[PDB]
């Protein structure tokens, strides 16, 4: 026998999921673990140094990571970067230099995103002053620093526009940025106040449709942003809760805690009873399935202590993640059906993502 390298991932792209393992106990050795969701098989991994973030290119061809290096890890010059990796060979291709202020924090989706057209990476900075950074993928260059987003947080791309995204601001509204084909801001707009920051703070994780986004609040309300037009129209609240739910103090909790099945309008939300101040990151006692058209719950199932989720539209799947284990659900019907659990997918992950298949 002869040992060889240079091999590609053994399962087709459509079977792959990406578990971002922060490895918080040893955060300088964070990594992405690649799994086959159909059978639980470990396919490979991408090292991501200190507190990496990850996403897959919209065309499915590349993996993008974001990380921080220092010349001697705990001393020496800092280098914040985006890296481009081949999705099939799981090999490093290109480093893109960032200013030394990329967000260091837990792996919410909205901290490291891309435009719908896939041409720009859109990332959150904190120095600690906040701004949004734009990376031109084709050029391999950081090309725009959106200081207009100061006092705002996270990136919600608009799936109905090629290079537009929104961010949640300290005023309780949304700032929309429309980038030109050069990655520089071409125009922007600010919505009216969507939610009271003080009285009904929202979770940042969107339940994202093609032309609108829904957000859930610390107290179980729902807010919406309609971006069918150039100006975002905001509304809410409606309550996730009926009177019985309120009596037992049900509220949302988690990190990447919501999802939307776009064909049906069903919104998935991690919920727990006995809500009170400080329980907003509690593991799910249940997953609730909400009809966003009728604004009523349709189903509820055990939560398996999940904290984060993601949805695949085309295969009608939901993944949930409890920090270490990934649950795979069929959501083709209103009641989700558990297909399998992948045990030991990570030591400390709050984010799982499917390989894109939609192009």
């Amino acid at each position: 026998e002869v040992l060889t390298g240079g091999h590609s991932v053994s399962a087709p792209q459509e079977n792959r999921i990406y578990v971002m393992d922060s490895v918080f106990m040893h955060l300088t050795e964070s990594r992405v673990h690649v799994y086959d969701y159909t059978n639980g098989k470990f396919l490979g991994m991408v090292p991501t140094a200190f507190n990496g973030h990850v996403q897959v290119s919209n065309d499915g061809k590349k993996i993008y990571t974001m990380t921080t290096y220092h010349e001697r890890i705990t001393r020496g010059k800092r280098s914040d970067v985006v890296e481009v990796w081949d999705a099939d060979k799981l090999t490093f291709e290109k480093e893109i230099s960032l200013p030394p202020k990329r967000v260091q924090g837990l792996n919410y989706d909205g901290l490291f995103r891309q435009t719908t057209d896939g041409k720009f990476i859109v990332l959150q900075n904190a120095s600690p002053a906040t701004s949004i950074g734009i990376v031109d993928v084709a050029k391999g260059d950081y090309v725009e620093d959106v200081t207009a987003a100061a006092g705002c947080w996270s990136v919600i791309p608009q799936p109905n526009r090629p290079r537009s995204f929104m961010t949640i601001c300290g005023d309780g509204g949304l700032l929309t940025i429309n980038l030109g084909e050069d990655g520089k801001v071409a125009s922007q707009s600010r919505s009216k106040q969507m939610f009271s920051v003080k009285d009904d703070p929202i979770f940042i994780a969107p339940a994202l449709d093609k032309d609108k986004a829904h957000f859930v609040s610390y107290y179980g309300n729902v807010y919406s942003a309609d971006f069918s037009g150039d100006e975002v129209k905001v509304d809410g609240p409606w309550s996730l809760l009926n009177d019985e739910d309120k009596a037992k103090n049900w509220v949302p909790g988690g990190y990447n805690l919501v999802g939307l099945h776009r064909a049906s309008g069903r919104m998935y939300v991690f919920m727990h009873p006995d809500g009170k101040e400080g329980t907003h990151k509690f593991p799910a006692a249940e997953i609730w399935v909400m009809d966003t058209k009728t604004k009523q719950r349709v189903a509820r199932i055990p939560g398996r202590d999940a904290l984060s989720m993601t949805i695949d539209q085309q295969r009608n799947l939901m993944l949930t993640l409890d920090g270490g284990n990934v649950n795979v659900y069929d959501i083709s019907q209103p009641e989700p059906k558990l297909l399998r659990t992948i045990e030991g997918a990570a030591e400390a992950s709050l984010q799982v993502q499917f390989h894109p298949v939609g192009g």
């Binding site: 918080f24 106990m25 040893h26 955060l27 300088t28 200190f50 507190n51 921080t68 220092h70 890890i73 705990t74 001393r75 020496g76 800092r78 202020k101 967000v103 260091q104 924090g105 837990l106 919410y108 959150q124 904190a126 120095s127 600690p128 906040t130 006092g151 705002c152 947080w153 996270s154 949640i168 601001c169 300290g170 920051v197 703070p201 929202i202 979770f203 940042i204 990190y255 101040e277 400080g278 329980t279 907003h280 990151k281």
Partner: protein, 110 residues
């Protein structure tokens, strides 16, 4: 008592308590560097019945302490209320941003 996640002043700690890491609640372990910035919590002192502002400065420039991990969230808010938010590394602006442990510094009455 101070090394417990339920100690009253640790009400918004997400990290490793520095008092378990060779430091104290208000001093960095040897060879780790205070952060000049922090998230802030408002915590109730059950002993005297008053509420206090607590500043969660990190100690930085050494790898993860690994002891006394806490994840408490009283009055914690998301990143659009940035200095109330604890899912970010408060070492982010240090000369070396590697996160070592979290301190709980008493500022005064809320």
């Amino acid at each position: 008592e101070v090394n417990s996640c339920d100690y009253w002043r640790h009400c918004a700690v997400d990290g490793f308590l520095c008092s378990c890491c060779g430091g104290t609640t208000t001093t960095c372990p040897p060879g780790s560097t205070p952060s000049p910035i922090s998230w802030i919590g408002t915590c109730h002192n059950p002993h005297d019945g008053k509420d206090y502002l607590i500043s969660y400065h990190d100690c930085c420039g050494k790898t993860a302490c690994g002891r006394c991990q806490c994840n408490t969230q009283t009055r914690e808010r998301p990143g659009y209320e940035f200095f109330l938010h604890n899912d970010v590394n408060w070492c982010m602006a240090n000369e070396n941003s590697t996160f070592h442990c979290t301190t709980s510094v008493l500022v005064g009455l809320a």
